[PDB]
Structures are given as C-alpha cells and as structure tokens.
Amino acid sequence: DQQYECVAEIGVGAYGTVFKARDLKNGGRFVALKRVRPLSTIREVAVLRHLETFEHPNVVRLFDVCTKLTLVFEHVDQDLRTYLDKVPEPGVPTETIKDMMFQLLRGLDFLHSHRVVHRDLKPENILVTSSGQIKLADFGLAVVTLWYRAPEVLLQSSYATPVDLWSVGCIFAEMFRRKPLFRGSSDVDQLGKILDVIGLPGEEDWPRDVALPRQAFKSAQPIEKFVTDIDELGKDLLLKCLTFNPAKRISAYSALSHPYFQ
Ligand SMILES: Cc1nc2c(F)cc(-c3nc(N[C@@H]4CCN(S(C)(=O)=O)C[C@H]4O)ncc3F)cc2n1C(C)C
C-alpha cells in the first residue's frame, strides 16, 4: 500500500510483522501497520471494525484495513514496559497507579462486554500516550511471557474473560514493584511460583481432568511481602484479581466499582 511508508520495525514473530509507518495521506502522522499473512480471520477483522465504531478511548484506533492482511492503527510512542523502566525513584506515584489501573480496566470492560478476550495482556501491549492515556493494543487476532498467564491457561482447562483479570492483577502488582510478580521459565514453573504466593487452592477449586494435579504442587503468603507499597483497598482489589478459581475472580466491570477507585 503506497499510502504508507514504513520507517522502523516495531516487532516481528507469529503475528507477521508490525511497522512504524508514515500515513502519507493523513498529514504524515505515524501509524503502526500490522502485516499478517478463510472464515476465522474474516470474522475476526469484522469484530475489530465493529469495536472501532465505538471509538473507546482505552483501545487503539483502527484507522484502516487492507487486503495479505494489513491493519492500520494509531501509533503510540511507548508501552507500559518502557514507562515503568523510565519512571524515577521512588516509583510510579500512587494516584498515577490508580488512574492507569482504572483506564486499563475500562478498556478491558469494553472488550469483555463485546465478547472479546485479550488473552495476552502484558505491559508490552498496554500503550501509554504522551498525555498519560492507556490504550490496549494487539488483541482480536489469533524470552517468552507466561508471567501474566492465568492458572487455568497454564493448566489448559479454561480460557474465558477471567484470564485477563489475572493478567490485570499481575500488572497491578508490577506497577508498584517495577518488576514482575511471577517470573517463571515454563508453564509448570509459572504455576509453582504463583502457588508459592497465593497458596494451594481447595481440592474443589482444582480443575477436573487436566494433566497437572494439585498433588504436583504451599501456603499463602501476605501479598504485602511482595507488593510493599500497596494500601489496604489496593490489596483487596489485587487479591480479587489473583483468585485461583476463574468463576470466583472479580470481573473488569465489578473492579471498576471497587472502593480503591473511589
Ligand atoms: C505483537 C504486537 N502487535 C501490535 C500491534 F498490532 C500494534 C502495536 C502498536 N504499537 C505502537 N507503538 C509501539 C509501542 C511500543 N514502543 S516502545 C515502548 O518504544 O517499545 C514502540 C512503538 O512504536 N503504537 C500503536 C500500536 F497499535 C504493537 C503491537 N505488538 C507488539 C510490538 C507489542
């Protein structure tokens, strides 16, 4: 598409390639062009176009779709990862953590209410604008990072919307620590490091018929030992996100009404 001129590679992998490009027809503004090499794909881009009609402030704008598939998004200069690496001591200000978490949960509630599950939420696809706005990116299309993966994904049992609320809890903790809460090197090591903190759940909370039984893995530790800067209300919301059983985990909609945000 000669309407765009690629100037830098943002990333490459399974998702094809994402480039930073000049939108030659729209005043030369920067855009992120995702080049991705059917019915599943056709339906997925139709869902992305539908979400864009709402123009939610907490998800990246989808400017164009070309067809061999190219998605054109607004460009955001930085991700949450870079924002956390550059924030000076003593860290992210308490009210900035609160604001970014509120916006993250609004973008996620928007996706969950239109039955889209992100499934790969991490600082790398949580974008931070020059005005401090949070914009979700890299969703809707089907070292590594299991650090934000929910226990039910690691166990290979369920994949519903609560999967993103576990990721939100990991990210919430990381905004205080400025280092990942659960840094595992494999699916089983990730689950062990999770249970080292939250403790073994009740036998009835363990999913039936999975390869890994409860027996393969522990007592709950005070979460403030790992997130020292967190307040009482923040702690209550953090634990509601880091609940082992997905049916008992708080939703993004209820999280938005938690006393922490009042
Ligand atoms: C896999 C994937 N799919 C993506 C996608 F569809 C869109 C974008 C995207 N990226 C950006 N910008 C990037 C943000 C990160 N930074 S940083 C902090 O300097 O490293 C580079 C920057 O060019 N803006 C909007 C997007 F939609 C980024 C995407 N990614 C990765 C690079 C996070």
Q: Return the HEC string of 68-101.
A: CEEEEEECCCEEHHHHHHHCCCCCCCHHHHHHHH
Give yes or no: residues 155 and 238 share one domain.
yes
197 falls within a domain: yes
In a domain, 117, yes or no: yes
- Are 85 and 199 members of one domain? yes
> Are 250 and 238 contacting, i.e. CB atoms less than 8 angstroms apart?
no
Give dist(CA 223, CA 213) in Å, integer. 25
Residue 56 in contact with residue 70, Cβ under 8 Å? no
Looking at the chain, the number of H-run helices and the number of E-run strands are: 8, 8
Q: 42 in a domain, yes or no?
A: yes
CB contact at 8 A, 164 and 121: yes
CB 166 within 8 A of CB 151: yes
Pocket test for ligand 1, best of 138, 141, 145, 148 (most atoms within 8 A of CB): 138
User: Based on the domain organization, do 157 and 29 belong to the same domain?
Assistant: no
Task: Tell me, in angstroms, the distance from the centre of ligand 1 to residue 115's CA.
Answer: 23
Technique behind the model? X-ray
Both 162 and 96 in one domain: the answer is yes
**Token output for 179:** 């280092």
For residues 249 and 185, give the distance between their C-alpha atoms in angstroms, rounded to a whole number. 25
Task: Kindly state whether residues 45 and 150 are assigned to the same domain.
Answer: no
* Residue with CA nearest ligand 1 atom 4: 138
- Domain of residue 69 covers 4-74
User: Is it true that the peptide bond before 123 is cis, omega within 30 degrees of 0?
Assistant: no
150 and 229 part of one domain: yes
| 167 in a structural domain | yes
| CB-CB contact of 210 with 198 (8 Å) | no
Mutate to test the pocket of ligand 1, among 6, 7, 10, 30 (most ligand atoms within 8 A of CB): 10
Residue 262 lies in a domain: no
Residues in contact with ligand 1 by the CB-under-6-Å rule are 10-11, 15, 18, 20, 32, 34, 60, 73, 75-76, 78-79, 82, 124-125, 127, 137-138
- Ligand 1 atom closest to Cα of 74? 25
Query: How many whole angstroms from 130 Cα to the centroid of ligand 1?
Result: 14
Q: Clarify whether residues 153 and 84 are in a common domain.
A: yes
- Of 17, 18, 74, the one to substitute when testing ligand 1's pocket (max ligand atoms within 8 A of C-beta) is 18
Whether residue 26 contacts residue 46, with contact meaning beta carbons closer than 8 Å, is answered with: no
128 phi, psi to nearest 5 deg: -120, 115
Q: How far is CA 198 from CA 145, 150, 161, 219, in A?
A: 20, 13, 21, 7
**Last residue of a domain, which of 74, 90, 125?**
74
Give yes or no for a contact between 16 and 28, defined as CB atoms under 8 angstroms apart: no
Query: What is the DSSP code (8-state) at residue 59?
Result: B
Closest CA to 181 of 160, 197, 164: 197
Q: How far is the CA of 261 from the centre of ligand 1 (A)?
A: 28
Which residues are the active-site residues? 120
Residues with Cβ within 8 Å of 33's Cβ and at least 6 positions away in sequence, in order, are 4, 6, 18, 19, 21, 70, 71, 72, 73
Q: Are residues 50 and 167 in the same domain?
A: no
Shared-domain flag, residues 155 and 222: yes
Measured distance CA(169)–CA(166) in Å, rounded: 5
Domain count, the chain: 2
CATH of the domain at 201: 1.10.510.10
Ligand 1 centroid–CA 222 distance in Å is 35
Resolution of the solved structure (Å): 2.0
How many angstroms separate the CA atoms of 19 and 5, rounded?
9
Of 35, 57, 74, the position where a domain reaches its end is 74
Domain boundary among the residues 12, 40, 74 is at 74
Query: What is the position in ligand 1's atom list of the atom closest to the CA of 79?
Result: 18
